[PDB]
Amino acid sequence: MIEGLSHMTFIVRDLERMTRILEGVFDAREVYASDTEQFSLSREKFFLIGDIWVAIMQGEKLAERSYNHIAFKIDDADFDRYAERVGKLGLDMRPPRPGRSIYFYDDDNHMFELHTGTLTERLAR
Amino acid sequence: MIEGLSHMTFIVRDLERMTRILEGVFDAREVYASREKFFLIGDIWVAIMQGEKLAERSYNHIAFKIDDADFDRYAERVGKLGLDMRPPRPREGRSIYFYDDDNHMFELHTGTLTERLA
Numbered sequence: 001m002i003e004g005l006s007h008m009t010f011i012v013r014d015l016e017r018m019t020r021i022l023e024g025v026f027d028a029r030e031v032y033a034s035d036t037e038q039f040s041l042s043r044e045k046f047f048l049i050g051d052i053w054v055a056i057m058q059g060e061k062l063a064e065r066s067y068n069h070i071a072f073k074i075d076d077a078d079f080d081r082y083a084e085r086v087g088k089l090g091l092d093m094r095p096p097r098p099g100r101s102i103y104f105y106d107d108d109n110h111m112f113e114l115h116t117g118t119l120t121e122r123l124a125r
Numbered sequence: 126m127i128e129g130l131s132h133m134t135f136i137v138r139d140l141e142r143m144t145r146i147l148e149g150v151f152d153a154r155e156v157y158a159s160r161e162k163f164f165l166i167g168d169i170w171v172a173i174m175q176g177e178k179l180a181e182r183s184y185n186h187i188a189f190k191i192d193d194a195d196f197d198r199y200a201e202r203v204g205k206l207g208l209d210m211r212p213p214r215p216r217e218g219r220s221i222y223f224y225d226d227d228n229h230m231f232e233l234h235t236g237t238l239t240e241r242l243a
């Protein structure tokens with residue numbers, strides 16, 4: 001049996017900028033940096049978004065953008081606030097459709113989504 | 126405030142094969158049916174939509190938590206499907222890494238963040 005999600009891992013060109021994205025958009029909390037170690041060549045950081053473990057490692061960006069995406073849940077009341085946060089970070093986004101979502105990209109062609117709706121709502125529609 | 130994970134969406138060339146992988150490896154259950162399908166892995170909403178496979182493989186990955194006592198079983202599930210799988214490192218704090226048919230890397234992992242932080 002699958003107990004739940006363990007972690008999601010993203011490879012990014014610039015660990016510092018990705019840190020600012022995860023902190024700026026999701027209020028991610030940095031819990032680990034391999035840079036606190038002596039002679040570790042590879043560079044990684046671990047973050048928590050609530051109880052979600054996100055790991056980032058420095059490497060190459062995704063070649064192309066695609067519609068593979070990871071979506072986090074927010075409340076409908078915070079939709080404009082979150083669109084603002086994405087704005088202040090200077091991130092590319094998909095246009096807001098006329099549940100609702102904000103889709104944006106980090107600096108390495110990963111797509112993320114902030115979605116106000118639920119599965120139950122989605123299936124009933 | 127982020128309330129939690131909403132869903133994860135994968136683009137795949139063949140929804141029937143992806144269905145078999147999700148059900149076969151993760152015990153995913155289908156709740157909605159070129160087009161999209163929806164699954165739950167426990168309370169994790171997964172959406173799959175027909176389209177183009179990732180040009181390239183990378184080490185970006187999604188990892189699911191399993192118990193160490195189930196490790197051999199899960200490795201046999203991935204193998205039974207003919208999925209491209211990294212031979213498990215003889216070990217704990219263990220992982221199984223595999224690609225589906227569309228260059229998405231997945232991981233089954235027996236350890237926790239807390240343990241890893243040690």
Ligand SMILES: [Mn+2]
Nearest residue numbers: 069071113134
């Ligand atoms: Mn989505």
Ligand SMILES: [Mn+2]
Nearest residue numbers: 009186188232
């Ligand atoms: Mn991993």
